[PDB]
Symmetry: C5
Subunit: 147 residues, 5 copies
């Protein structure tokens, strides 16, 4: 966090890339397990002018989203907070693919399809539900209640 990025800054000013790389990598790993650091380190990576660190952190958080739906909501909001067309495409794909095998996401998506009301989102979701409903009766009654 704050002390790690401060040491990072001072080491980069001193030089010694062999130390700076390890400080950066430990920040990256701490960002994986402690998610409230993700919003920090990410915005740090942009400020240093390092596209590689920023892109790798985007990667880490995006593929961490598929194993932790709270981080999925985080990245789904962050996609709009940045206004990026890589985040806003790949998150809105991993979500509309993860909904198939994780069934509470199949309700988060149904709430987004009215809070955002995206036409393409709704037209995808209707097909998701119609494909699921014939092989999963709980999804059938879910389609009954959502109307």
């Amino acid at each position: 966090v704050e002390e790690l990025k401060r040491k990072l800054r001072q080491a980069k000013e001193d030089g010694d890339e062999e130390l700076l790389e390890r400080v950066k990598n430990e920040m990256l790993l701490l960002a994986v397990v402690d998610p409230r650091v993700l919003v920090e380190v990410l915005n740090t990576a942009k400020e240093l002018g390092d596209e590689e660190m920023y892109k790798k952190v985007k990667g880490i958080m995006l593929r961490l989203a598929v194993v932790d739906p709270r981080v999925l909501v985080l990245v789904l909001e962050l996609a709009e907070a940045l206004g990026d067309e890589e985040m806003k495409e790949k998150v809105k794909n991993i979500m509309l693919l993860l909904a198939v095998v994780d069934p509470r996401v199949l309700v988060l998506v149904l709430e987004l399809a009215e809070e955002l009301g995206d036409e393409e989102m709704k037209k995808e979701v209707e097909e998701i539900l119609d494909k699921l409903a014939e092989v999963d009766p709980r999804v059938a009654v879910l389609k009954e209640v959502a109307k």
Copy 2:
């Protein structure tokens, strides 16, 4: 949290929207991942007199509820604490829709149908239980034990 609240307030009394926007957005992002911060970020949003921040934070916590059932009690109690006709509507709806596909919430709904003891709630939950038990024998055993 305390530091971001202090920063936002001090910026607000000295102006310079370009800093206020960034601090506010980072605070919302932090609140997405740290639910303990939410009850703070919400109230501060009300204090500034900006219904837009407060409304977006209600949005964030509400759609966070459908992917983290710990928050589903937080917002459920917060609806009574505020007495807002949206929270009391949409939170009740996402419960009586999420119960279809996540039975830990189904038992929570069965407990609410007596701790609040609302007639409209129980008489609707009867339909959920019937439609599930008709096509899923485990929920039929649940209906047997809960009666």
Copy 3:
């Protein structure tokens, strides 16, 4: 919690029931999302001398149990630590209801049926297993292994 405790104390010496409601409500909500505060706010309510906040906290944590099985052990032990015939009945009921649809609890209760060894517990558990085994084939193997 310490700041909220101090604020509640300073509010109590001078009235201001609106301040009391605000601080107490923030304590209640903080207790919903940070379970290690549950035991604190519970007893602070008791020493303060208000049956209503105490019973509301008993409600909040009890219905939080059915959505977070880590708090289930907390309330199950706190029932005996208090000796309250309310907790010791309602928790011993939500377990023998929640086990029907959640199968990790179905081997938590089976540990109580020997570490407490109650006849009621063992009899009810035998009934639960006999009902589930004919409609959930996997649990049949459980009935074979728990021999």
Copy 4:
């Protein structure tokens, strides 16, 4: 924890069994929901010489495992760290019983069978796999891959 430690030490030094018992019960309850304190409080149980506190804490942290697999790995390592025959006997039973209903453990056991390499472990677990695999189709593929 340090505050509760100082309070219990002062209570022991004076000889006020009521305050000491109460604060120890509060510590026990705190240990239920903040598991990174368990190995601490357990140790304190050995420090005071209270075999009863030691046994109750062993019970709490053991039956907490069947609802939180992180505590399951904790107690699984702690059984070897202590060398207690009850911990080593009973964790290697609640695990080989929890595996039947929770499939994430079914690839935690399968890693122990080689990292600890116990002959009895593998010879017992073969029965679990062969019983599940004929009544749960995914386990058939799980057995096809792990061979």
Copy 5:
């Protein structure tokens, strides 16, 4: 961890291998139950010049991975952060065996199938999907949507 780190580093310079064993087991057990300490306890183990503590911590964290999918992503990054040929070998097998019985992992591996693009890993994933899809319709719809 920093306090236990300091105590251990002091004990290393004054002997008393029993004190060292004690602080070591303290750090190890704290690491199992609070994952953000792992990357710390690992690196210190390497710095002291004790391959055995480092190997034990690798064991513990890899074993914890199969019951905590966030540590799965942690070790999945750490594998290439070190470059070691056990993590890169064994993590890429506990994952491609855990995916069989965990539906969220089946949409984590499918992102790596392009984020690293390993042809043999893509073939492994196709084999997993083809085996699952004929005995689990959810996976059939997942295969349909993924293309």
